[PDB]
Amino acid sequence: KSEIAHRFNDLGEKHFKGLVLVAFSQYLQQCPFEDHVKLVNEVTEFAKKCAADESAENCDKSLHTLFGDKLCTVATLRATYGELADCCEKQEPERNECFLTHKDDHPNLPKLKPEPDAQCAAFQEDPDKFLGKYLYEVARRHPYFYGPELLFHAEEYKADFTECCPADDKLACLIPKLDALKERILLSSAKERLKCSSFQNFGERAVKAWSVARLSQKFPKADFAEVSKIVTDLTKVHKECCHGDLLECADDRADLAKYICEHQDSISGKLKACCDKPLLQKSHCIAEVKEDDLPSDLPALAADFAEDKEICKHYKDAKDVFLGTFLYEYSRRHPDYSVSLLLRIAKTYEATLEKCCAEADPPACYRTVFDQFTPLVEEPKSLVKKNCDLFEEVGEYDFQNALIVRYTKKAPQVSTPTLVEIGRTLGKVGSRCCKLPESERLPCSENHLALALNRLCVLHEKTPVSEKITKCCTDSLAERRPCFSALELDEGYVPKEFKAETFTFHADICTLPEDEKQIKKQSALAELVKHKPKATKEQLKTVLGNFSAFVAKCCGAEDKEACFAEEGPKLVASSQLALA
Ligand SMILES: O=C(O)COCCN1CCN([C@@H](c2ccccc2)c2ccc(Cl)cc2)CC1
Ligand SMILES: O=C(O)COCCN1CCN([C@H](c2ccccc2)c2ccc(Cl)cc2)CC1
Ligand SMILES: [Cl-]
Ligand SMILES: [Cl-]
Ligand SMILES: [Cl-]
Ligand SMILES: [Cl-]
């Protein structure tokens, strides 16, 4: 009868209110926290009224009708969100579709800076307001953040403050926990954004494929029917959360967690620990669960997929099913491959069949299909071993620098902050992945690279600057990483004309945190590449070394500014000659 009552009843007031605040914060990213609280309280009041009597007027309205109506009441909607006011002239589902089209992925809001004393003060003063504000701040900064996961992270955030405010030293307890929390927020936001991107740009089939591969790796003991069930249910969960239907997404996600845990013996031995936890914890634990051991009875795949005489008939009859089973089977056997590698392998299997089945003697043609995968496997494996070597040789900062040079050459039209961000993000991937046991390096590296490349692609939709990026971001998802890897110096670029102030430093650099100091230097690096795009990476590193020496020296000087002013122009002029 009443959907709003149904969800209120299923989720309870706490989670209902939390998720509604998330939904609204994500749709309306600029309003103050206090204004969103009021919309949430009103919506909740109405849900309670409807729960008491579902036949009361408007109670039987859809959630989109009710929530879209609520959003469209907000003060200063024309002035703050000119685009969203336009959406408010439409009915559902056109209105919601309009709301979705107009979410902002890079709202450029100030960085969230921990103030241990004033925050612990606010936490004690009003814990509920303090935690809601956390939901709001993160939600408006990550408009596709997986709703229920944000409630999970809010409870961690709560645990951090409960542990660390009563202690003697606040900042020493807190700042490591909050820095770790922030990193987990970023990773999580990137994973989910890839999911929503994949729905948006490649459709539901791509999400399902991705998911078949990854879930088969994690749960290799499960049969194709179980994996398919879970994939079907999890795809629906992510489709709902990506479309802003957070209440339905949360309810369906809880049902999925329940199902997995009731069938854990047939799904995976690694689920036991997850399944003895509370709800949000349980879902999160399942989501991050480690891959199960390979079962000793995994089937030989040649008979069914290369040697059977009727593969063309079975392929022709039920393409999406035959290929799905292939993907399930190959993936469960290959936790050592990345998901995109498995998707490339599946596409090569398909293409081999389309070719062989239109020739005279298909069996003799498709008998070698598995051997077609060999080159697909070896390229990424070599690329990872190669980059983990550079990483172990030079350490994180220089690895970052090398990637900055590499990506700036590929796409020098991209903004310097974005180029630095991606280079820095991919350098951190080396830190994480290269330290792992070697068989895990490939999936770790390539799965994380996908997240960073997707971030680049998302930015590029909003701020297009390069046709080569556009092609890599919009041709097949499986080929995205190879496409980016195959880009070379955009020769079409006209070297950015020299501006000396771009390479001019001052003494304020000396007061910066180390990371911020590095970002300054890395920004200069990217700018050096834009002005001298044919310079070798070794020329660029030599010049960057001189910039570092100069900053370290002038920051150690008695008269820092006099140092920077006398030495800066020399360095700048010298560096042009060094980059020829
Ligand atoms: O749709 C087209 O553009 C032309 O038709 C190609 C149809 N194939 C079907 C198989 N499909 C892959 C595929 C999709 C997305 C990324 C890689 C492979 C797939 C494998 C297993 C599963 Cl369960 C679902 C889909 C790729 C496209
Ligand atoms: O007043 C009482 O008797 C004690 O009840 C407090 C109930 N609160 C309501 C606000 N809830 C906030 C909240 C604050 C502001 C807006 C929406 C929800 C919330 C914070 C974190 C998560 Cl994970 C979920 C909910 C928490 C529970
Ligand atoms: Cl996001
Ligand atoms: Cl689709
Ligand atoms: Cl994972
Ligand atoms: Cl160095």
XYZ file of C-alpha atoms and ligand atoms in Angstrom:
638
model
C 0.000 0.000 0.000
C 2.486 2.673 1.267
C 6.085 2.285 0.085
C 7.328 4.928 2.506
C 5.757 2.976 5.414
C 7.058 -0.317 4.073
C 10.671 1.013 4.046
C 10.322 2.787 7.439
C 9.094 -0.500 8.902
C 11.848 -2.587 7.245
C 14.769 -0.327 8.068
C 13.817 1.320 11.319
C 13.949 5.037 12.092
C 17.713 5.317 12.583
C 18.684 3.792 9.244
C 15.661 5.380 7.425
C 16.635 8.830 8.613
C 20.332 8.281 7.915
C 19.720 7.081 4.349
C 17.226 9.871 3.586
C 19.835 12.428 4.723
C 22.370 10.730 2.448
C 19.933 10.711 -0.547
C 19.167 14.411 -0.096
C 22.804 15.450 0.568
C 23.847 13.675 -2.627
C 21.109 15.264 -4.755
C 21.531 18.774 -3.137
C 25.222 19.168 -2.383
C 25.384 22.916 -1.506
C 22.645 23.420 1.185
C 23.575 23.729 4.841
C 23.365 20.708 7.114
C 20.578 22.263 9.227
C 18.308 22.658 6.162
C 18.668 18.977 5.168
C 17.816 17.923 8.744
C 14.413 19.639 8.361
C 13.541 17.901 5.097
C 14.538 14.574 6.669
C 12.479 15.188 9.793
C 9.435 16.077 7.648
C 9.806 13.036 5.417
C 10.205 10.861 8.547
C 7.173 12.406 10.254
C 5.172 11.589 7.113
C 6.485 8.010 7.092
C 5.362 7.580 10.695
C 1.905 8.965 9.828
C 1.691 6.563 6.901
C 2.919 3.623 9.026
C -0.035 4.245 11.372
C -2.506 4.326 8.494
C -1.411 3.428 4.958
C -4.782 4.479 3.423
C -4.282 8.160 4.432
C -3.918 10.550 1.474
C -0.578 10.690 -0.386
C 0.694 7.675 1.607
C 0.408 5.486 -1.486
C 2.633 7.815 -3.554
C 5.906 6.543 -4.913
C 9.106 7.406 -3.083
C 10.271 9.424 -6.070
C 7.127 11.389 -6.110
C 7.382 12.073 -2.353
C 11.128 12.755 -2.231
C 11.309 14.676 -5.489
C 8.455 16.841 -4.149
C 10.444 17.417 -0.963
C 13.607 18.394 -2.857
C 11.651 20.832 -5.024
C 10.332 22.748 -1.947
C 13.874 23.832 -0.915
C 14.565 27.572 -0.522
C 16.762 29.334 -3.101
C 16.605 26.339 -5.543
C 16.811 28.590 -8.688
C 19.779 30.617 -7.343
C 21.737 27.705 -5.867
C 20.942 24.903 -8.392
C 19.628 26.504 -11.613
C 19.684 23.060 -13.237
C 17.633 21.348 -10.545
C 14.837 23.937 -10.643
C 14.340 22.889 -14.314
C 13.953 19.284 -13.165
C 11.189 20.405 -10.769
C 8.920 21.364 -13.684
C 8.782 17.664 -14.696
C 6.721 14.733 -13.406
C 8.140 11.321 -12.443
C 9.964 9.417 -13.773
C 11.255 12.267 -15.987
C 12.003 14.408 -12.936
C 14.204 11.796 -11.228
C 15.979 11.078 -14.516
C 16.685 14.825 -14.650
C 17.933 14.809 -11.031
C 20.292 11.926 -11.916
C 21.602 13.602 -15.082
C 22.555 16.668 -12.972
C 24.574 15.280 -9.949
C 28.074 16.839 -9.503
C 31.189 14.606 -9.126
C 33.715 17.395 -8.447
C 31.931 20.077 -6.373
C 35.345 21.443 -5.124
C 34.194 21.919 -1.507
C 36.831 22.557 1.169
C 38.896 19.588 2.399
C 37.603 17.900 5.559
C 40.174 18.864 8.238
C 40.157 17.116 11.681
C 39.932 19.533 14.671
C 40.200 17.045 17.591
C 39.190 19.468 20.376
C 36.183 21.202 18.754
C 34.919 17.924 17.209
C 35.167 15.924 20.449
C 33.370 18.943 21.978
C 30.585 18.739 19.351
C 30.406 14.907 19.726
C 29.837 15.143 23.510
C 27.525 18.154 23.085
C 25.271 16.425 20.558
C 26.358 12.964 19.256
C 23.367 12.537 16.922
C 23.932 15.920 15.258
C 27.684 15.194 15.056
C 27.203 11.848 13.282
C 24.491 13.179 10.948
C 26.822 15.994 9.923
C 29.400 13.332 9.034
C 26.865 11.556 6.778
C 26.011 14.908 5.135
C 29.625 16.044 4.549
C 30.741 12.793 2.964
C 27.504 12.303 1.017
C 27.612 15.754 -0.607
C 31.293 15.168 -1.516
C 30.551 11.723 -3.020
C 27.150 11.831 -4.673
C 27.199 8.114 -5.701
C 28.603 6.798 -2.404
C 26.991 3.444 -1.626
C 24.373 4.524 0.936
C 24.412 1.613 3.469
C 28.235 1.565 3.402
C 28.237 5.234 4.440
C 26.106 4.299 7.501
C 28.703 1.612 8.266
C 31.539 4.109 8.072
C 29.599 6.539 10.258
C 29.613 3.908 13.042
C 33.403 3.578 12.718
C 33.620 7.343 12.868
C 31.530 7.094 16.053
C 33.840 4.369 17.509
C 36.897 6.566 16.819
C 35.453 9.519 18.808
C 34.166 7.321 21.691
C 37.660 5.770 22.066
C 39.765 8.889 21.566
C 38.011 11.854 23.262
C 38.282 10.520 26.880
C 42.036 9.758 26.386
C 44.935 12.023 27.438
C 46.213 12.817 23.920
C 43.292 13.376 21.478
C 45.115 14.045 18.202
C 47.539 11.081 18.581
C 44.621 8.728 19.109
C 42.350 10.376 16.494
C 44.370 11.624 13.500
C 45.722 8.156 12.552
C 42.208 6.659 12.811
C 40.555 9.485 10.828
C 43.294 9.431 8.132
C 42.753 5.680 7.736
C 38.961 6.246 7.689
C 39.338 8.919 4.989
C 41.407 6.544 2.813
C 38.718 3.855 3.154
C 36.048 6.406 2.230
C 38.016 7.265 -0.967
C 38.539 3.669 -2.018
C 34.936 2.801 -1.344
C 33.608 5.832 -3.213
C 35.823 4.858 -6.212
C 34.521 1.255 -6.308
C 30.906 2.258 -6.233
C 31.428 5.065 -8.740
C 32.838 2.430 -11.167
C 29.636 0.448 -10.678
C 27.378 3.456 -11.417
C 29.622 4.497 -14.361
C 29.313 1.015 -15.739
C 25.488 1.121 -15.565
C 25.449 4.626 -17.109
C 27.950 4.162 -19.946
C 27.888 0.429 -20.690
C 24.622 -0.858 -19.230
C 23.445 -3.599 -16.965
C 25.058 -6.450 -18.923
C 28.518 -4.945 -18.240
C 27.829 -4.752 -14.508
C 26.563 -8.339 -14.514
C 29.633 -9.561 -16.433
C 32.013 -7.754 -14.094
C 30.151 -9.214 -11.194
C 30.040 -12.793 -12.477
C 33.822 -12.662 -12.829
C 34.581 -11.131 -9.434
C 32.075 -13.211 -7.466
C 33.279 -16.417 -9.132
C 36.833 -15.554 -8.037
C 35.666 -14.948 -4.457
C 33.293 -17.896 -4.197
C 34.827 -20.598 -6.370
C 33.040 -23.326 -4.369
C 29.607 -21.961 -5.317
C 27.752 -23.401 -8.339
C 26.730 -21.333 -11.390
C 23.144 -21.084 -10.084
C 24.258 -19.611 -6.739
C 26.676 -17.179 -8.299
C 23.920 -16.130 -10.794
C 21.382 -15.603 -8.041
C 23.801 -13.437 -6.079
C 24.862 -11.537 -9.194
C 21.216 -10.885 -10.099
C 20.435 -9.635 -6.580
C 23.593 -7.583 -6.126
C 23.157 -5.936 -9.546
C 19.673 -4.864 -8.535
C 21.099 -3.480 -5.259
C 23.719 -1.407 -7.099
C 21.288 -0.263 -9.827
C 18.954 1.090 -7.066
C 21.745 2.851 -5.065
C 23.253 4.355 -8.254
C 19.785 5.682 -9.212
C 19.351 7.360 -5.801
C 16.795 4.804 -4.458
C 18.731 4.347 -1.262
C 15.930 2.923 0.942
C 15.160 0.167 -1.557
C 18.894 -0.422 -2.104
C 19.444 -0.834 1.664
C 16.486 -3.153 2.135
C 17.512 -5.367 -0.799
C 21.141 -5.362 0.349
C 20.053 -6.685 3.796
C 18.005 -9.425 2.195
C 21.094 -10.374 0.119
C 23.380 -10.524 3.149
C 20.775 -12.740 4.860
C 20.580 -15.061 1.866
C 24.388 -15.386 1.533
C 24.732 -16.173 5.275
C 21.920 -18.762 5.235
C 23.661 -20.459 2.287
C 27.230 -19.894 3.474
C 28.282 -23.607 3.523
C 27.522 -23.942 -0.212
C 28.981 -20.466 -1.008
C 32.314 -20.126 0.914
C 34.170 -21.110 4.082
C 35.408 -17.521 4.466
C 31.891 -16.198 5.254
C 31.602 -17.676 8.802
C 33.332 -14.700 10.446
C 31.193 -12.206 8.485
C 27.960 -14.027 9.193
C 28.302 -13.808 13.063
C 28.325 -9.959 12.914
C 25.617 -7.230 13.139
C 23.793 -6.156 9.934
C 25.886 -3.277 8.520
C 29.052 -5.062 9.632
C 27.856 -8.288 7.987
C 27.156 -6.659 4.606
C 30.466 -4.813 4.652
C 32.329 -7.978 5.657
C 30.747 -10.005 2.819
C 31.601 -7.191 0.381
C 35.307 -7.294 1.357
C 35.585 -11.017 1.921
C 38.807 -12.742 0.870
C 38.725 -15.314 -1.924
C 37.971 -18.880 -0.894
C 40.454 -21.724 -1.464
C 40.144 -23.429 -4.807
C 38.123 -26.640 -4.514
C 39.975 -29.825 -5.477
C 37.147 -30.866 -7.906
C 37.177 -27.846 -10.261
C 36.303 -29.262 -13.727
C 38.677 -29.503 -16.702
C 37.316 -26.929 -19.147
C 38.653 -28.189 -22.509
C 35.968 -30.849 -23.053
C 33.064 -28.374 -22.834
C 34.686 -25.206 -24.241
C 37.218 -26.362 -26.864
C 36.666 -30.047 -27.743
C 32.878 -30.536 -27.791
C 31.663 -30.940 -31.394
C 28.415 -28.954 -30.893
C 29.832 -25.723 -29.392
C 28.595 -23.651 -32.347
C 25.002 -24.982 -31.894
C 25.098 -24.362 -28.109
C 26.695 -20.962 -28.652
C 24.106 -20.055 -31.343
C 21.198 -21.290 -29.134
C 21.971 -19.404 -25.907
C 24.945 -17.065 -26.365
C 24.640 -15.083 -23.098
C 24.230 -18.325 -21.068
C 27.035 -20.320 -22.714
C 29.429 -17.351 -22.314
C 28.279 -16.723 -18.768
C 29.128 -20.285 -17.772
C 32.481 -19.901 -19.505
C 33.159 -16.705 -17.600
C 32.035 -18.271 -14.281
C 34.301 -21.285 -14.787
C 37.414 -19.479 -16.004
C 37.080 -16.828 -13.317
C 36.704 -19.182 -10.366
C 39.951 -20.906 -11.468
C 41.754 -17.544 -11.825
C 41.901 -15.433 -8.661
C 45.401 -14.567 -9.976
C 43.848 -12.525 -12.864
C 42.252 -9.067 -12.764
C 38.542 -8.745 -13.501
C 39.131 -6.779 -16.700
C 41.625 -9.436 -17.892
C 38.888 -12.079 -17.396
C 36.432 -9.887 -19.282
C 38.998 -9.515 -22.122
C 39.471 -13.284 -22.091
C 35.676 -13.785 -22.327
C 35.451 -11.347 -25.224
C 38.291 -13.198 -26.985
C 36.505 -16.503 -26.423
C 33.323 -15.074 -27.942
C 35.154 -13.559 -30.915
C 37.007 -16.837 -31.559
C 33.672 -18.683 -31.664
C 31.963 -16.107 -33.998
C 34.928 -16.536 -36.380
C 35.345 -20.331 -36.215
C 31.595 -21.041 -36.460
C 31.337 -19.164 -39.792
C 34.190 -21.238 -41.349
C 33.865 -24.699 -42.965
C 35.348 -26.831 -40.152
C 34.621 -25.024 -36.888
C 35.969 -27.757 -34.505
C 39.556 -27.632 -35.892
C 39.401 -23.823 -35.667
C 38.073 -23.505 -32.074
C 40.191 -26.376 -30.646
C 42.973 -23.836 -29.902
C 40.710 -21.171 -28.309
C 42.426 -21.325 -24.835
C 45.802 -20.688 -26.486
C 44.430 -17.317 -27.769
C 44.381 -16.143 -24.117
C 48.118 -16.534 -23.601
C 49.048 -13.106 -25.006
C 46.214 -11.409 -23.122
C 47.595 -12.785 -19.845
C 51.254 -11.996 -20.474
C 50.980 -8.272 -21.343
C 49.394 -7.147 -18.056
C 51.674 -9.533 -16.073
C 54.741 -7.919 -17.628
C 53.405 -4.414 -17.231
C 52.858 -5.108 -13.449
C 56.238 -6.782 -12.819
C 57.886 -3.936 -14.726
C 56.161 -1.223 -12.687
C 56.663 -2.987 -9.338
C 60.406 -3.058 -10.235
C 60.512 0.680 -10.917
C 58.572 1.135 -7.670
C 60.949 -0.959 -5.512
C 63.950 0.782 -7.207
C 62.750 4.371 -6.673
C 60.072 4.505 -3.964
C 56.646 6.057 -3.934
C 57.376 9.751 -4.695
C 59.471 9.142 -7.814
C 57.126 6.434 -9.014
C 54.361 9.010 -8.760
C 56.575 11.447 -10.698
C 57.186 8.975 -13.464
C 53.441 8.365 -13.799
C 52.756 12.103 -13.831
C 55.172 12.480 -16.740
C 53.613 9.456 -18.451
C 49.996 10.707 -18.137
C 50.833 14.362 -18.920
C 52.428 13.201 -22.173
C 49.313 11.136 -22.974
C 46.871 13.951 -22.236
C 48.529 17.343 -21.745
C 45.176 19.121 -22.162
C 44.038 17.725 -18.791
C 44.286 20.095 -15.849
C 47.419 20.026 -13.729
C 45.522 19.178 -10.503
C 43.846 16.181 -12.204
C 47.095 14.994 -13.737
C 48.833 15.209 -10.337
C 45.918 13.475 -8.583
C 45.892 10.499 -10.944
C 49.661 10.135 -10.906
C 49.653 10.273 -7.135
C 46.749 7.795 -6.945
C 48.501 5.306 -9.255
C 51.727 5.632 -7.314
C 49.834 4.606 -4.145
C 48.548 1.568 -6.012
C 52.192 0.521 -6.384
C 52.700 0.909 -2.620
C 49.644 -1.227 -1.841
C 49.943 -3.875 -4.563
C 53.666 -4.384 -5.141
C 54.186 -5.369 -1.490
C 51.645 -8.207 -1.790
C 52.547 -11.855 -2.548
C 53.327 -11.978 -6.222
C 50.243 -13.872 -7.417
C 48.033 -11.105 -5.976
C 49.933 -8.254 -7.634
C 48.167 -8.453 -11.014
C 44.546 -8.332 -9.719
C 45.435 -5.719 -7.082
C 47.207 -3.444 -9.589
C 44.769 -3.688 -12.472
C 41.600 -3.627 -10.315
C 42.802 -0.446 -8.607
C 43.957 1.091 -11.906
C 40.375 0.671 -13.179
C 39.108 2.746 -10.276
C 41.578 5.580 -10.988
C 40.970 5.478 -14.767
C 37.280 5.597 -14.078
C 37.738 8.667 -11.902
C 39.564 10.314 -14.812
C 36.785 9.321 -17.193
C 34.089 10.745 -14.864
C 35.908 14.076 -14.651
C 36.277 14.005 -18.413
C 32.502 13.727 -19.034
C 32.034 17.004 -17.194
C 35.221 18.697 -18.505
C 36.160 17.199 -21.884
C 39.636 18.198 -23.112
C 41.041 15.319 -25.241
C 39.533 13.111 -27.951
C 41.958 10.323 -27.083
C 40.698 10.242 -23.472
C 37.131 10.279 -24.788
C 37.764 7.197 -26.947
C 39.464 5.264 -24.135
C 36.685 6.188 -21.717
C 33.764 5.282 -24.056
C 34.942 2.318 -26.167
C 34.739 -1.094 -24.393
C 35.159 -1.071 -20.583
C 37.258 -4.233 -20.727
C 39.771 -2.466 -23.062
C 39.995 0.750 -21.089
C 43.318 0.046 -19.379
C 45.043 -1.237 -22.561
C 43.674 1.764 -24.411
C 45.196 4.138 -21.899
C 48.459 2.151 -21.849
C 48.702 2.398 -25.661
C 48.446 6.189 -25.684
C 51.697 8.042 -26.402
C 52.692 11.664 -26.458
C 49.867 13.580 -28.047
C 51.950 15.152 -30.858
C 48.924 17.358 -31.727
C 49.561 19.321 -28.524
C 51.174 22.740 -28.970
C 53.677 23.124 -26.138
C 52.132 25.318 -23.499
C 53.843 28.669 -23.779
C 56.228 29.563 -21.027
C 54.937 31.443 -17.952
C 57.779 31.971 -15.478
C 55.452 32.539 -12.441
C 54.178 28.954 -12.902
C 57.694 27.803 -11.842
C 58.233 30.509 -9.236
C 58.367 29.359 -5.586
C 58.024 31.350 -2.354
C 58.632 30.780 1.352
C 55.040 29.723 2.103
C 56.021 26.329 0.607
C 58.270 25.797 3.702
C 55.342 25.868 6.137
C 53.403 23.182 4.230
C 52.878 19.541 5.299
C 55.161 17.162 3.403
C 52.420 15.798 1.149
C 51.375 19.355 0.216
C 54.972 20.287 -0.463
C 55.205 17.259 -2.811
C 52.013 18.250 -4.595
C 53.523 21.680 -5.285
C 56.632 20.095 -6.786
C 54.578 17.546 -8.727
C 52.389 20.336 -10.110
C 55.555 22.063 -11.375
C 56.633 18.739 -12.856
C 53.400 18.425 -14.836
C 53.794 22.006 -16.031
C 57.363 21.250 -17.169
C 55.992 18.434 -19.262
C 53.281 20.695 -20.762
C 55.907 23.248 -21.795
C 58.497 20.637 -22.977
C 56.485 17.601 -23.909
C 59.332 15.813 -25.737
C 61.732 16.100 -22.814
C 62.698 12.600 -21.609
C 61.471 11.543 -18.193
C 65.153 11.464 -17.147
C 65.662 15.090 -18.227
C 62.486 15.994 -16.256
C 63.625 14.157 -13.143
C 67.030 15.877 -13.265
C 65.318 19.290 -13.437
C 62.887 18.287 -10.656
C 65.869 17.300 -8.540
C 67.195 20.827 -8.943
C 63.860 22.296 -7.938
C 63.859 20.161 -4.815
C 67.436 21.147 -3.864
C 66.504 24.788 -4.331
C 63.388 24.525 -2.139
C 65.243 22.618 0.624
C 68.066 25.191 0.541
C 65.874 28.298 0.445
C 63.630 26.881 3.220
C 66.780 26.394 5.381
C 67.969 29.944 4.670
C 68.031 32.763 7.259
C 66.215 35.036 4.785
C 64.048 32.548 2.934
C 62.358 35.008 0.626
C 65.603 36.701 -0.442
C 66.869 33.186 -1.274
C 63.805 32.271 -3.341
C 63.920 35.670 -5.152
C 67.635 35.523 -6.081
C 67.756 31.817 -6.942
C 64.332 31.270 -8.526
C 64.790 32.963 -11.936
C 68.181 31.230 -12.412
C 66.660 27.845 -11.821
C 63.803 28.695 -14.150
C 66.080 29.818 -17.019
C 68.515 26.923 -16.477
C 65.695 24.376 -16.540
C 64.469 25.443 -20.018
C 67.941 24.673 -21.414
C 68.042 21.286 -19.586
C 64.737 20.262 -21.186
C 65.632 20.859 -24.857
O 26.212 -6.079 -27.874
C 27.002 -5.728 -28.779
O 27.519 -4.596 -28.891
C 27.351 -6.743 -29.853
O 27.109 -8.058 -29.291
C 28.131 -8.654 -28.467
C 27.467 -9.506 -27.405
N 28.452 -9.942 -26.377
C 27.813 -10.800 -25.382
C 28.815 -11.202 -24.291
N 29.185 -9.982 -23.613
C 30.137 -10.367 -22.453
C 30.877 -9.169 -21.845
C 30.187 -8.030 -21.404
C 30.864 -6.934 -20.863
C 32.249 -6.963 -20.744
C 32.941 -8.094 -21.180
C 32.269 -9.187 -21.726
C 29.469 -11.139 -21.322
C 30.050 -12.315 -20.837
C 29.440 -13.010 -19.789
C 28.252 -12.527 -19.228
Cl 27.468 -13.335 -17.945
C 27.675 -11.359 -19.709
C 28.283 -10.668 -20.747
C 29.907 -9.130 -24.512
C 29.033 -8.775 -25.682
O 16.291 11.318 21.573
C 16.356 10.121 21.933
O 15.521 9.527 22.658
C 17.575 9.353 21.474
O 17.317 9.012 20.092
C 18.278 9.404 19.088
C 17.989 8.707 17.774
N 18.958 9.218 16.749
C 18.270 10.009 15.720
C 19.330 10.583 14.754
N 20.089 9.527 14.042
C 21.169 10.112 13.158
C 20.667 11.164 12.160
C 21.010 12.502 12.378
C 20.562 13.504 11.517
C 19.755 13.172 10.434
C 19.414 11.839 10.217
C 19.858 10.838 11.075
C 22.008 9.006 12.496
C 23.401 9.055 12.614
C 24.191 8.041 12.068
C 23.599 6.963 11.408
Cl 24.600 5.693 10.733
C 22.207 6.904 11.301
C 21.417 7.918 11.850
C 20.702 8.645 15.079
C 19.686 8.117 16.088
Cl 30.973 9.448 -5.644
Cl 22.078 -3.386 -20.683
Cl 37.216 -6.704 -3.180
Cl 64.129 12.009 -4.946
